[PDB]
Amino acid sequence: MFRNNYDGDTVTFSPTGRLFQVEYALEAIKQGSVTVGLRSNTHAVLVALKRNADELSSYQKKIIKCDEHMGLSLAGLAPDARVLSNYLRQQCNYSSLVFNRKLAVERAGHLLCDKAQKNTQSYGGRPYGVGLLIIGYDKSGAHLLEFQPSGNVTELYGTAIGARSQGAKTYLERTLDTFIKIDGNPDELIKAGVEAISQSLRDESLTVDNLSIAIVGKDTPFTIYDGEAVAKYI
Amino acid sequence: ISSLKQFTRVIRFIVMDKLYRVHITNVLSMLVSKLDMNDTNLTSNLINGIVSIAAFIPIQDLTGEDDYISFESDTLPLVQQHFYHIKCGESSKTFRVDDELLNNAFKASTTVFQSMLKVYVEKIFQLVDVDLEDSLVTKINQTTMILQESMDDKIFNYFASLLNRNFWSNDSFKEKDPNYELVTIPLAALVRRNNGLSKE
Amino acid sequence: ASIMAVTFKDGVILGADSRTTTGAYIANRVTDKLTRVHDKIWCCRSGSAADTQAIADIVQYHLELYTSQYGTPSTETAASVFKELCYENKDNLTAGIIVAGYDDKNKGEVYTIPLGGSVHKLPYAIAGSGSTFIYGYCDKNFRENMSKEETVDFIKHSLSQAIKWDGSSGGVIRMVVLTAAGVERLIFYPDEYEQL
Amino acid sequence: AGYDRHITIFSPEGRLYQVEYAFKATNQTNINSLAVRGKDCTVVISQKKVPDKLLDPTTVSYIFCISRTIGMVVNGPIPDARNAALRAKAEAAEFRYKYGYDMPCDVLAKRMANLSQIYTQRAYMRPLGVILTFVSVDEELGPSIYKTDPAGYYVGYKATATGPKQQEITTNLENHFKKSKIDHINEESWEKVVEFAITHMIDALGTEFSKNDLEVGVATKDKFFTLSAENIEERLVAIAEQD
Amino acid sequence: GTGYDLSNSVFSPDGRNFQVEYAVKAVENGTTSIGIKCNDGVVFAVEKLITSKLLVPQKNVKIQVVDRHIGCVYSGLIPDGRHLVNRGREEAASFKKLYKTPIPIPAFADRLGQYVQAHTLYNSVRPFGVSTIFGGVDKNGAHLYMLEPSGSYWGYKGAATGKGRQSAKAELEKLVDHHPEGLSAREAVKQAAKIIYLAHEDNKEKDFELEISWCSLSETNGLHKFVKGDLLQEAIDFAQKEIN
Amino acid sequence: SPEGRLYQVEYALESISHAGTAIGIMASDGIVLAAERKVTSTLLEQDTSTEKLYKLNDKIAVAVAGLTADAEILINTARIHAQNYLKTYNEDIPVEILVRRLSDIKQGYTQHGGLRPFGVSFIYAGYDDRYGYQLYTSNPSGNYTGWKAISVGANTSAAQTLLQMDYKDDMKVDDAIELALKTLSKTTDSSALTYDRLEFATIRKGANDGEVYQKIFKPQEIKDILVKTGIT
Amino acid sequence: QIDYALTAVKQGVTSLGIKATNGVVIATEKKSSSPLAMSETLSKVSLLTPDIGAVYSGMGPDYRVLVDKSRKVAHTSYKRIYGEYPPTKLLVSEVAKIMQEATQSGGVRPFGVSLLIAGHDEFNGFSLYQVDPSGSYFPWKATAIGKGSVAAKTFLEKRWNDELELEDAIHIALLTLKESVEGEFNGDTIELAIIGDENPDLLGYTGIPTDKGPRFRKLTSQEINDRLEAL
């Protein structure tokens, strides 16, 4: 068989130029449930598929509020998102107190990139192991970002991360010119987010307990719809 | 390191099966050039290969002047085709080649001995300045002396004017405390074979 | 103390008295209040001798090191290193300093750092205890772009007065001329500046 | 296991493997240098090799100005040279401030060699792959040339050489102080001492130099400065019109 | 035994720090990025690859600005570019705060040099995964620098790094050959756009946006503005014409 | 620590049965200490060291069997505890308390297993007005024990036997001076015992009153009591 | 690991020490790493206090930074408290403690030197000590360390009596060094120091009769050659 000598920690470069410990983390993303993100010129939506343990247990929350203008969804390691979603919650709330200024989305991207990067220079600590779709309406429109644990944060119209992420990522890729023109309609942009996350399900059936949706933009502050609130989209 | 031991404990047998033998010139001139100056271990395990190939092979130009010759055009193309075949699940029994082409490949394969020794001698003088020590200094002198004995006068008389040449014009005995052994002895083994070289 | 610096056509000139007093007693009557932080960047000290000395000493360093790495220091920079020390340490210092120097681009440059730690670029600046008496003479008798000996005279008179009227000022009058052609140290004695 | 080859600890025969290797790095640039004493000057010649046509020769320097008085020339990878030069440029500014006189050549060397020693005795820090050649015209000792190495060693030379063809250059000098039987080069103007330093290097390397293949540093009393592109061509022109 | 290449501070038997050489490989396998020094400034250019159709056009900026008058562009691990440019600014603002003048290019370079070089000193921190091209305009004209993971840095007339390294370096040498006095601030921009468009054939699989910024003593009065709108199409259209 | 074993300890506990050889005998009206000196060269300066017999306070003293540079690190800190218990309670420190104070530092490494145990084993001879004369022992185990007579180091198992034989409770001090030398008849790898291979000490009922003198023997004083039989 | 450092000591230039009745002497050779180097710029025999000197065998640098750390400890831990300088016995103790800590501390290797420290304190008289990398230290009538260690140590037993005048011990330590010498043998490749009478000549001042000057004197390039002719 085939052993690896350069995958020990994060302070170690593979001969071909690769940080294996990071490539491995980037894979922890795909070890958690699927979530989807998309935006028009006036709104940004998130759809996540909360996963449960027994028939007898609650469902893991997959979307977290950050400020009244910005929120994110997670696919991957939960505690790593609790830790990052919290840091984001702070900067947002500091840009509010010191400068009385809603923290730009483009900037929380730049700030998380640098936060995750720190965990790939250091001996001892493992990299972050979760992916984040981040949404918000800042002074510059609607916005969506993809946060991989490598540090690479990228701004998009839509994407999807996790278990069978590929079903939606390919729907959105074709729907592009259609949904980014869903301005001034909120109910219709969610109808789309949900018709995309459902390409990534097998014979699987969205219910009031499976579905988690969040939205934000122009004159809608970041709100989260779990439970019965989500029924109208099924 | 494993698949270099697999291959060494089996070199002598490859020199026989009239198909594999073709590869042996290539695999050698590849080992020689891949002789590392930082990895003491990889080098000990390469010399293993290099000396085994020399112990069971005559360093000789076997071309009857047949014009098509050349290592490319005639050997390389075949070697790659055999490998492509072997790699895709297929075995060597399924591998069909003309007894004409496969003997062109084999004879043309015995041309590279000259251009490869210029690269072994180069790699020796680089090793004069390394903290490789003892066990491995010796084993390297065996490879240089075995390589000599498996040489026809055509090739040897070249190897000689190449030690002679490089021994005088060299920028290779700096570092503190050198392994002179690796270069003085291979000279003595030239004079063993050709006393005439001594007078001068 | 009692010090000033003036710019002109060819560069900048620094001037001072030489009298450090503790009380009514002149502890030293030959003080070198013109202190050097670089080839052609000098200062005028006034205030605590112990404070102005310590600072200039520490600036002489910052600039010797700046030279090592980054090269020759703008006159502007010398000033910034002074301000940074004086301002960021205001609560524990009593020093009023005049930084003056010659580069080739701007020629004559002068920065006065009052007590606060503020910094003010000017054509000429006076300071030190006995300055109060010549704000009048100077504003009336100063001109831009003076000749070398025109400026020596302007300083000799201004300082001849300050010393007449101030008890905390006196000694000899020291000058230091900073031009392209080099550093020239001046001295004028009492038998001379009093008869003016 | 076999890990006394990776950190600054003792092999079984009292050897510091990591230091011996560190030395091997000082050649990795492939520049040679030499230094000489005058009646009252000091000179350092280094080679300048600019292969990339995209480079700017003016930024390519292995000669560092450490103080008004003190010059340093490094054999070794550029990154390590600068790490050392910056630390010396600052140990010598601090020295002037704390102690009131300019920092003397041999003291700066003892202080960098002391430093170079800690690296040689602490697990976690690595020595630098550099050999620092320090020159000056120190106010007490005269022309000075002091060299420190990754080993922690320092000592003062009549003249010296460092790098790849080090011993070819060294043995040329040895045979010219066996012959004038002194500790210096009896010429007054530094110009003739620079010409001499270039001469005995051409002789020893068996190649000619152009105004672009050399870097010259010079120390007189009260100054250490480096020669410009042209200040060298003049020196070369004079060699060629007598030799 | 061996194992001389799993630890960062560690000297190979013949003077080499292997972990650094591996990082250079990560540089070589990333976006291609260049710099050109003209007669009164510098021009910078980068290749932005387009993973999918969903990446937003013009909206994932790679070129970072330092102070007001300095530009940085890097090739490789992008987050390491950011961590380096951050320490780059903390440094350029330490300098300004104390010495008033905004930090001189050569002095800025020496400061990055030491941060990087100092990341090659202990077994417990890995070198940067970027070769960084940076420069600007100071008291004495224009300066272009490049700085690899080892800490090495020099001043270039032009520079490249990235997958399309050897390719750009060669078109770059072509201009330094034809026009020794340097290009015009405006021309250098048209040409940088050519050179990126070419060094893209070494990565022609995916699609790309161009990104240019510059710092010119005549065309942006010493500051580091980006190249946008009409002047950007000016050059995108000049590349298309020298690709066909 | 596999079967309930203190490995890094036994390591050093048996490194002790190599170096040195020391003895302590408690008489009814005094105490005695004694040691053999390490492999000596002709040129080593005999009189200076006092290398294996150290004074701790005017009323306490230890014999060492172990690494010298290692015991000095201990003794230095024990001479101090002595003086802290003075400056603090204005009474001389009680022997057991000093012993425990060390034993506790020994066992400090026998557990915070991030630093290396102690060479060295101690015999302590001391007097305090709470428990007459005392004799104690200190292996790097951390344990201490009471003794009417004891030994540490090479040939330990052997002397413990002769000691058990010739000892009587009514013993005087001079009677115990002999028993100590006498039974470094056997336990001596050097055939024949000299004054220079020795170091000696006593804590008697004073050279005068009802009090307590302490006495580290000068070389000559040894060649004088060696005179009583050993060599003559 | 301490054992490997003692091994770096076992090679590296020979050095020695001899105590007498009225003085101590220590010497080593100055092996020139080149003829280009001026050997006067490096001192193998260093002053610690004006009553105490030291010589080594082994790793050059480790000696330097040990001579420095050593001078300082003489002040920081003695002179600044009691107004006197430290006694040989105790300054030696404070150096052993310094090296013994490089041993038992993590992240650092012990020093590659054995030291010979010679000196005179008012109460203990003359004495000569050896200090090993292990942090152990022993008192010597005379000994040697380094390569020539075994040859010279044997010669010293043969030639040493406890009635030596210091001039006799200088004579010996020159012969002893003549048999081991690696390079040439003169005043430029021998370093010799003594710890003898008080040298008022070398105080630098005159006016207090209670302090009389350094006992430590380092023989000049000349004084050596002079003795080697009548040798």
PDB file of C-alpha atoms in Angstrom, chain A residues 5-6 10-17 19 106 110 113-114 117 120-121 123 143 150-152 154-158 172-173 176, chain E residues 5-6 19 22-23 25-26 52-57 59-61 77-80 82-83 86 119 123-129:
ATOM      1  CA  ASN A   5       4.703  11.420   5.189  1.00  0.00           C
ATOM      2  CA  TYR A   6       3.676  15.038   4.740  1.00  0.00           C
ATOM      3  CA  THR A  10      -0.358  21.978   9.237  1.00  0.00           C
ATOM      4  CA  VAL A  11       3.161  23.284   9.535  1.00  0.00           C
ATOM      5  CA  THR A  12       4.246  20.835   6.851  1.00  0.00           C
ATOM      6  CA  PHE A  13       4.335  21.374   3.082  1.00  0.00           C
ATOM      7  CA  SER A  14       4.040  18.375   0.760  1.00  0.00           C
ATOM      8  CA  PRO A  15       6.874  18.125  -1.820  1.00  0.00           C
ATOM      9  CA  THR A  16       4.439  19.048  -4.639  1.00  0.00           C
ATOM     10  CA  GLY A  17       3.518  22.224  -2.738  1.00  0.00           C
ATOM     11  CA  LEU A  19      -0.699  21.364   2.721  1.00  0.00           C
ATOM     12  CA  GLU A 106     -17.288  42.222   1.541  1.00  0.00           C
ATOM     13  CA  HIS A 110     -11.842  39.469   4.289  1.00  0.00           C
ATOM     14  CA  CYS A 113     -10.287  34.527   5.559  1.00  0.00           C
ATOM     15  CA  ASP A 114      -7.614  35.949   7.849  1.00  0.00           C
ATOM     16  CA  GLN A 117      -5.567  31.404   7.807  1.00  0.00           C
ATOM     17  CA  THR A 120      -2.904  26.911   9.049  1.00  0.00           C
ATOM     18  CA  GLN A 121       0.415  28.581  10.035  1.00  0.00           C
ATOM     19  CA  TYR A 123       1.912  23.963  14.843  1.00  0.00           C
ATOM     20  CA  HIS A 143     -24.277  39.689  -1.344  1.00  0.00           C
ATOM     21  CA  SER A 150      -8.540  27.125   3.658  1.00  0.00           C
ATOM     22  CA  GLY A 151      -9.171  30.825   4.011  1.00  0.00           C
ATOM     23  CA  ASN A 152     -10.382  31.241   0.465  1.00  0.00           C
ATOM     24  CA  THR A 154     -15.218  33.977  -2.725  1.00  0.00           C
ATOM     25  CA  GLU A 155     -18.215  36.128  -3.689  1.00  0.00           C
ATOM     26  CA  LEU A 156     -21.001  34.567  -5.775  1.00  0.00           C
ATOM     27  CA  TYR A 157     -24.573  34.707  -7.065  1.00  0.00           C
ATOM     28  CA  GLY A 158     -25.241  31.178  -5.823  1.00  0.00           C
ATOM     29  CA  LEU A 172     -27.995  27.248 -10.034  1.00  0.00           C
ATOM     30  CA  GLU A 173     -25.311  27.171 -12.723  1.00  0.00           C
ATOM     31  CA  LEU A 176     -28.269  31.960 -13.265  1.00  0.00           C
TER      32      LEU A 176
ATOM     33  CA  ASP E   5      12.500  17.950   5.060  1.00  0.00           C
ATOM     34  CA  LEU E   6       9.602  17.604   7.461  1.00  0.00           C
ATOM     35  CA  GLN E  19      10.348  23.175   3.348  1.00  0.00           C
ATOM     36  CA  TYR E  22       8.363  23.064  -1.378  1.00  0.00           C
ATOM     37  CA  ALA E  23       6.497  26.312  -0.763  1.00  0.00           C
ATOM     38  CA  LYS E  25       6.204  24.818  -5.679  1.00  0.00           C
ATOM     39  CA  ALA E  26       2.865  26.109  -4.329  1.00  0.00           C
ATOM     40  CA  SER E  52     -17.742  28.479 -12.177  1.00  0.00           C
ATOM     41  CA  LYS E  53     -20.239  30.858 -13.844  1.00  0.00           C
ATOM     42  CA  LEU E  54     -21.421  31.945 -10.401  1.00  0.00           C
ATOM     43  CA  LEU E  55     -18.289  33.875  -9.459  1.00  0.00           C
ATOM     44  CA  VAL E  56     -19.222  37.540  -9.665  1.00  0.00           C
ATOM     45  CA  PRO E  57     -17.450  39.627 -12.341  1.00  0.00           C
ATOM     46  CA  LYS E  59     -15.932  41.521  -7.540  1.00  0.00           C
ATOM     47  CA  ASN E  60     -13.203  39.272  -6.120  1.00  0.00           C
ATOM     48  CA  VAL E  61     -10.244  41.618  -5.814  1.00  0.00           C
ATOM     49  CA  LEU E  77      -1.917  30.307  -1.406  1.00  0.00           C
ATOM     50  CA  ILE E  78      -4.145  33.381  -1.350  1.00  0.00           C
ATOM     51  CA  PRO E  79      -4.818  33.592   2.420  1.00  0.00           C
ATOM     52  CA  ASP E  80      -1.058  33.771   3.018  1.00  0.00           C
ATOM     53  CA  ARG E  82      -3.491  38.389   2.955  1.00  0.00           C
ATOM     54  CA  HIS E  83      -1.717  37.521   6.207  1.00  0.00           C
ATOM     55  CA  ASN E  86      -1.658  42.645   6.778  1.00  0.00           C
ATOM     56  CA  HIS E 119       9.149  32.390   9.080  1.00  0.00           C
ATOM     57  CA  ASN E 123      10.545  24.010  12.965  1.00  0.00           C
ATOM     58  CA  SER E 124       7.132  25.194  14.182  1.00  0.00           C
ATOM     59  CA  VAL E 125       5.979  27.681  11.528  1.00  0.00           C
ATOM     60  CA  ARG E 126       5.752  27.157   7.779  1.00  0.00           C
ATOM     61  CA  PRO E 127       7.096  29.597   5.173  1.00  0.00           C
ATOM     62  CA  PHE E 128       4.758  31.720   3.169  1.00  0.00           C
ATOM     63  CA  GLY E 129       3.046  30.061   0.213  1.00  0.00           C
TER      64      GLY E 129
END
